[PDB]
Amino acid sequence: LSQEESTLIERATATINSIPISEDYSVASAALSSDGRIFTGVNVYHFTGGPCAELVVLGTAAAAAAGNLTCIVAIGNENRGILSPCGRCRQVLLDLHPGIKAIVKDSDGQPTAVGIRELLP
Amino acid sequence: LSQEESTLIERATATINSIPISEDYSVASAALSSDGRIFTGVNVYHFTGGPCAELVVLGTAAAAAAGNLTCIVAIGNENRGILSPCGRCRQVLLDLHPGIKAIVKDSDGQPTAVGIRELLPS
Amino acid sequence: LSQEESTLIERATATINSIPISEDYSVASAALSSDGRIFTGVNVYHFTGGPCAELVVLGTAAAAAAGNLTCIVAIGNENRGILSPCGRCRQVLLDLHPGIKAIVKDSDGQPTAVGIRELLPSGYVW
Amino acid sequence: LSQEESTLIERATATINSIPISEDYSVASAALSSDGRIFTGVNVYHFTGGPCAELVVLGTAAAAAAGNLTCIVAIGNENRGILSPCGRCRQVLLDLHPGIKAIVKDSDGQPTAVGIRELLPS
Ligand SMILES: CN(CC[C@H](N)CC(=O)N[C@H]1C=C[C@H](n2ccc(O)nc2=O)O[C@@H]1C(=O)O)C(=N)N
Ligand SMILES: CN(CC[C@H](N)CC(=O)N[C@H]1C=C[C@H](n2ccc(O)nc2=O)O[C@@H]1C(=O)O)C(=N)N
Ligand SMILES: CN(CC[C@H](N)CC(=O)N[C@H]1C=C[C@H](n2ccc(O)nc2=O)O[C@@H]1C(=O)O)C(=N)N
Ligand SMILES: CN(CC[C@H](N)CC(=O)N[C@H]1C=C[C@H](n2ccc(O)nc2=O)O[C@@H]1C(=O)O)C(=N)N
Ligand SMILES: [Zn+2]
Ligand SMILES: [Zn+2]
Ligand SMILES: [Zn+2]
Ligand SMILES: [Zn+2]
Numbered sequence: 001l002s003q004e005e006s007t008l009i010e011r012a013t014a015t016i017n018s019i020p021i022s023e024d025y026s027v028a029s030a031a032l033s034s035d036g037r038i039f040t041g042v043n044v045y046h047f048t049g050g051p052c053a054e055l056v057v058l059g060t061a062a063a064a065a066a067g068n069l070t071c072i073v074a075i076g077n078e079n080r081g082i083l084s085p086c087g088r089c090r091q092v093l094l095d096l097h098p099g100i101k102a103i104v105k106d107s108d109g110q111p112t113a114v115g116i117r118e119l120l121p
Numbered sequence: 122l123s124q125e126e127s128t129l130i131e132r133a134t135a136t137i138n139s140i141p142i143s144e145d146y147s148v149a150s151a152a153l154s155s156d157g158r159i160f161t162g163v164n165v166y167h168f169t170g171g172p173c174a175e176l177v178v179l180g181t182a183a184a185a186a187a188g189n190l191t192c193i194v195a196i197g198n199e200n201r202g203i204l205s206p207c208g209r210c211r212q213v214l215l216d217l218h219p220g221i222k223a224i225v226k227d228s229d230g231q232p233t234a235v236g237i238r239e240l241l242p243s
Numbered sequence: 244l245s246q247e248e249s250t251l252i253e254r255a256t257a258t259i260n261s262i263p264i265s266e267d268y269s270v271a272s273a274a275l276s277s278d279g280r281i282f283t284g285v286n287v288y289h290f291t292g293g294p295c296a297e298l299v300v301l302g303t304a305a306a307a308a309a310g311n312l313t314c315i316v317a318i319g320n321e322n323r324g325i326l327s328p329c330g331r332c333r334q335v336l337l338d339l340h341p342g343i344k345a346i347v348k349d350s351d352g353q354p355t356a357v358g359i360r361e362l363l364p365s366g367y368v369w
Numbered sequence: 370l371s372q373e374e375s376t377l378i379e380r381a382t383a384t385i386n387s388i389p390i391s392e393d394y395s396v397a398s399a400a401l402s403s404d405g406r407i408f409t410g411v412n413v414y415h416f417t418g419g420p421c422a423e424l425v426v427l428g429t430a431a432a433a434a435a436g437n438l439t440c441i442v443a444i445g446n447e448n449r450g451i452l453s454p455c456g457r458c459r460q461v462l463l464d465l466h467p468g469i470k471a472i473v474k475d476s477d478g479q480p481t482a483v484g485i486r487e488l489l490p491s
Contacts, residue, residue: 015184024217025183042184044176046213048331049292049418051172051180055165059177062146063136063163087463087489088291091456092167096145104491119490120456169457170292170418197369207367208334209417215330225365235365241330242364243347258432267465268431285432287424289461294420294428298413302425305394306384306411335415339393 001103001113005071008032008103009082009111012053012075015040027083029053031061031072031100039066054089058096071113073103082111090120122232125153126192126224130203130232133174133196136161142198150174150195152221154187175210179217192234194224203232211240244354248314248346251275252325252354255296255318258283270326272296274304274315274343282309297332301339314356316346325354333363370480373401374440374472378451378480381422381444384409396452398422400441400469402430408438423458427465440482442472451480459488 008030016028019042027043029052041056051059053074061069072093074083084104085093093100094116101113122130129151137149140163148164150173162177172180174195182190193214195204205225206214214221215237222234251273259271262285270286272295284299294302296317304312315336317326327347328336336343337359344356360366370378377399385397388411396412398421410425420428422443430438441462443452453473454462462469462485470482 019183019186022183025180028184040184041177041180044172044179044183044213044217045290046216047288047290047292048209048212048295048329049170049290050213051165051176052291053180055172056162056177056180056184058165059146059162059172059174060181062140062143062165063149063161063177065140084491086291087456087458087460088169089456090459090489091169092165092171094456095167096165120459121488121490166416168414168416168418169421169455170416173417201369204369205365205367207417208330208332208337208363210330211333211363212330240363240365241333242362243327262431262434265431268428271432283432284425284428287420287428287431287461287465289464291457291460292418293461294413294424296428298420299410299425299428299432301413302394302410302420302422303429305388305391305413306397306409306425308388331417334417335413335419338415339413 001111004032005103005113008071008073011038011040012073015042016075016077021077026077027053027074029057029072029074031057031069033061033066034068034070037066039064052086052089054085055092069097069100071101071103090116094120122234126234129153129159129192129194132159132161133194136163137196137198147198148174148195148204150178150193152178152182152190152193154182155189155191158187160185160187173207173210175206176213190218190221192222192224211237215241244356247275248356251281251314251316251346254281254283255316258285259318259320264320269320270296270317272300272315272317274300274312276304276309277311277313278309280309282307295329295332297328298335312340312343314344314346333359337363370482374482377401377440377442377472380407380409381442385411385444385446390446395446396422396443398426398441398443400426400430400438402435403437403439404435406435408435421455421458423454424461438466438469440470459485463489
């Protein structure tokens with residue numbers, strides 16, 4: 001990944017580590033816009049489909065007229081590190097930001113940014 | 122409404138008015154935390170249940186360690202004004218912020234802050 | 244409560260008592276069509292918003308070309324009895340079957356059918 | 370494609386073709402259980418995440434104590450044929466029926482049954 005993309009990991013990690021330990025708010029996400037800005041968010045757990053952290057980030061970016069997002073990552077609390085977006089997120093990301101990459105762990109546990117279509121054939 | 126509650130309407134209105142007209146991003150929301158901070162967000166439309174503006178606000182508040190939220194409102198694009206929270210939002214709000222009020226239009230069309238339970242009556 | 248409405252309770256109760264005890268599948272629902280038919284369903288728990296039992300009923304009715312539904316009820320496992328529809332279900336029910344009633348417990352814990360609009364005052368509309 | 374896989378396509382197709390054309394109810398799904406039954410369903414469109422046809426099938430199978438589902442397909446109205454499950458369905462399917470296959474179109478447009486994990490690659 002680029003150093004710009006590497007900053008997303010730092011930002012999402014700082015976000016989740018900065019809030020009280022919660023079962024409702026347990027994952028942070030950060031995304032990079034095509035114009036260089038970073039947007040963050042935290043998940044909202046609910047059985048009716050409370051948004052994943054990634055979806056909160058999408059709404060936060062949209063609130064800032066961010067336009068295209070080029071990369072996204074999610075980081076779990078309790079030092080869990082990078083978590084791949086769930087299938088719901090993969091679908092919303094493909095549909096609203098088809099040019100986006102997601103940061104996931106490679107075969108060696110190392111961060112890599114992959115095109116959303118690779119995660120949702 | 123209280124002065125603070127009125128400010129939520131202004132903030133959410135400014136937020137939705139500021140972004141490109143979109144079918145995907147068409148409602149803004151603003152919520153007040155107990156400490157007086159305001160958090161905003163815009164909906165993300167998706168058939169799988171992309172979050173309402175209110176839920177984006179909840180995640181934005183949580184990201185800032187806002188704690189308990191006391192009031193929330195949603196404002197539609199294209200001068201639609203106050204929109205009540207939908208049923209899913211009411212459930213999430215009740216479960217995560219039971220002390221919260223939502224701003225809705227009363228029977229005379231005037232803004233009123235209503236306890237979340239009163240929006241999910243028995 | 245009408246005889247037909249009461250049958251919804253019996254049916255949903257039968258359904259939840261006819262499946263293994265599960266944390267994924269823990270509530271049953273039944274609805275009545277204007278054509279007299281009854282449609283059932285159970286919930287599918289998932290954090291991304293797996294459907295409530297009521298929503299599974301809606302898709303089951305739709306698969307049978309049921310048309311308009313007039314009443315719905317949900318019955319919980321662990322002998323919980325009648326469970327009011329959640330906010331999400333209230334919205335979907337109002338939007339897709341605006342004339343529907345939901346069976347809920349009254350003050351004395353007894354079954355009563357109320358109009359969906361009564362369960363969502365000051366509705367989201369534009 | 371095996372006999373039972375072709376049969377699921379036929380059952381889902383008959384289901385969607387048998388109901389009035391609707392923007393709310395526009396996709397049917399069918400799934401096979403290991404105990405020798407087939408369950409159908411149609412989608413319920415709603416912005417809060419009304420269930421996909423596949424999720425209606427999952428609740429219909431659950432209502433019948435079906436246990437393990439081994440194959441699923443979705444068929445669109447107006448002669449659209451096979452539709453791949455969306456990302457949310459893939460996630461729910463993986464989590465609740467990890468042994469399931471979904472019928473999708475291959476590169477030639479022909480039906481193929483693929484393990485659910487293949488549809489959510491790393
Ligand atoms: C009954 N509960 C739920 C407790 C759950 N054990 C929390 C959980 O699993 N949360 C996960 C859901 C969203 C979430 N998530 C999942 C997928 C994705 O793409 N993005 C996310 O933010 O990660 C969370 C996590 O792993 O901690 C509460 N009291 N809140
Ligand atoms: C993307 N689309 C779908 C267009 C939909 N007709 C938009 C809509 O109704 N959106 C509503 C969903 C969320 C949303 N909302 C709804 C309820 C609620 O509690 N909060 C919200 O943010 O308001 C939106 C609105 O009214 O504009 C297309 N390209 N055709
Ligand atoms: C970690 N988990 C989740 C366990 C939950 N404690 C189950 C639950 O609360 N389920 C509720 C969600 C849907 C659901 N429901 C809720 C509202 C509504 O309107 N209809 C429903 O079917 O009722 C269920 C119930 O009360 O048993 C799993 N292993 N599955
Ligand atoms: C204006 N509208 C919405 C109309 C939409 N154009 C219908 C749609 O796209 N529906 C899709 C959603 C579910 C759905 N679906 C999608 C994915 C999946 O895995 N299973 C599904 O059943 O397929 C449907 C379809 O393709 O027709 C209403 N008031 N109803
Ligand atoms: Zn997700
Ligand atoms: Zn809502
Ligand atoms: Zn519900
Ligand atoms: Zn789906």
